[PDB]
Symmetry: C2
Subunit: 323 residues, 2 copies
């Protein structure tokens, strides 16, 4: 009935049109060391975040899930300021990134001491049921991530802790898959440890263009996410046209009640500013929060996707996911 | 004539008895995501640090080089509070940790953009000549680190940026070697790119117990640090007994003008508190800031080492290094 947001409990029936994976702030681990040349511009960042929320609102979005990992710039008080200003529901996460794009040392050390998995579980429980730091804000989802072609032993501690915390809380699990791999493995390993497939979103599924792969993942009953629309030519990502072709295939197979769509935008980059060089810059020009509604969804309409199906993906699925 | 400390410029003639490598604060990268259960307790942390500064003061220490990496909890305003309270000089660093104990994703990403090495030089320069963040404190040393058996291509970016920055500033370089490897390779690679051997300290050289390895590194003209006295049974460390035996052999060969000593303490761990399991716990029991002066230094004296040699290592060498 309720979900925890950055503005406290909101009824699930009032979530409305929802983007399941968007980052208002994000920084790659290691950004914290470049503070002198890449310090956080709080108020200009707010204006950018707020303006992104307003772009999203102009297409009817009422809720955004922001699954920024704990050490990647997750800032719940900042997200609360966005939501208070814009009236948008924002759900944040508890969790850590995968090995190759994260900071493994800290919890690697605690595995050596033999308390890592228990420490992760305790973090998850605290941030789900009490609050993050002193913000008073509970996370609404557990964020999980796995490496390319592998759920490493390090990563599996988080999967196991996540399953245990979901058994205790009912919290939704949202995942990251690296370069279109481990989708079925993620679902199977979480289920092995008692997670609920109805509360799982396997992410970055648009990273794999083989509809057999998605069907392997869908058979577990989980949700999948085509959540990187507009990312092309980097992090191994396929083209948007490949994303559209794979999605139409599944949708023409009757899989609407399990598919959610998003962009995985980074609206404010933490650390030092940058501009992508000449080739990616072109491929990445549609990586913004209006892309799905200005470009992708008109194309889906022309391919015969009906409003009820879209509405199923943007409204019905998040509502079922969080209830 | 002057070195920058966390209380502005200090004459090199006034540094006195110096510990070349001690961490007041330190956290393994990834500690930033454990904020709810591992918050930084400022008051108590200050109390603990101030006490470490006084324990060092009672054995004549007037200066400490704190080489904590930028993303490992380096906190120059906090260090300044310790120094102002205690009168100790504290010199801090600019630098990143090696791959296996750090967060590479951030600067790995900037290498894809082609800007990483330049960005690292820009960071070194700003922190050495302008200030860290808005603290007004300049780093006094560049901190470098490499992996076990390799100076990776990621690490080499920082090595080349450090050599570049030293050519511009005359700043001292302090290094971390992993598990007794790559001492000769660090010196050779730094000198290849124009770095000054009189301004380099190759660290954790006590991790290697073969005097030929040490002599190989010494042949480059650089300083070397037996800076891990008290660490045993962890991180591949050999015993203090092995440390002493190696150190006596070098001192008996006349190498005292190139050797410096320290413990590499972590006086306040960042993130969540922990307790070492019982095998490691007793082996580590001497890892504190008085161990040199209570245990190691007097046993060296019993073995014939003269007071003027010790003073060369604790006083003469830091003075030579920073001038
Ligand atoms: Fe994401
Ligand atoms: Fe150290
Ligand atoms: O992501
Ligand atoms: O260290
Ligand atoms: Zn992701
Ligand atoms: Zn070190």
């Amino acid at each position: 009935e309720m979900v925890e947001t950055v503005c406290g409990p909101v009824p699930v029936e009032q979530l409305g049109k929802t983007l399941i994976h968007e980052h208002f702030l994000f920084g790659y681990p290691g950004f914290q060391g470049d503070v002198t040349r890449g310090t956080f511009r709080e108020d200009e960042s707010l204006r950018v975040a707020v303006e992104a929320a307003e772009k999203m609102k102009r297409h009817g979005i009422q809720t955004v899930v922001d699954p920024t990992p704990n050490d990647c710039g997750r800032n719940p008080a900042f997200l609360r300021r966005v939501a208070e200003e814009t009236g948008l529901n924002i759900i944040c996460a508890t969790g850590y990134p995968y090995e190759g794009e994260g900071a493994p040392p800290y919890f690697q050390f605690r595995r050596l001491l033999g308390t890592a998995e228990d420490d992760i579980y305790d973090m998850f429980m605290a941030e789900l049921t009490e609050g993050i730091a002193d913000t008073g804000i509970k996370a609404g989802v557990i964020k999980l991530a796995s490496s390319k072609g592998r759920i490493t032993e390090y990563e599996k501690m988080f999967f196991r802790a996540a399953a245990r915390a979901q058994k205790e809380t009912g919290a939704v699990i949202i995942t990251h898959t690296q370069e279109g791999t481990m989708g079925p493995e993620q679902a199977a390993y979480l289920l092995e440890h008692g997670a609920d497939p109805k509360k799982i979103v396997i992410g970055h599924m648009c990273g794999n263009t083989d509809p057999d792969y998605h069907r392997k993942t869908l058979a577990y009953g989980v949700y999948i996410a085509f959540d990187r629309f507009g990312i092309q030519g980097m992090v191994g990502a396929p083209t948007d046209e490949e994303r559209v072709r794979t999605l139409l295939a599944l949708l023409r197979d009757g899989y609407e009640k399990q598919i959610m769509l998003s962009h995985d935008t980074v609206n404010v980059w933490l650390g030092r500013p940058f501009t992508l060089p000449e080739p990616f810059a072109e491929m990445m020009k549609n990586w913004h929060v209006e892309h799905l509604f200005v470009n992708i969804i008109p194309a889906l309409k022309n391919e015969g996707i009906r409003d009820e199906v879209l509405e199923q993906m943007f409204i019905g699925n998040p509502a079922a996911l969080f209830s």
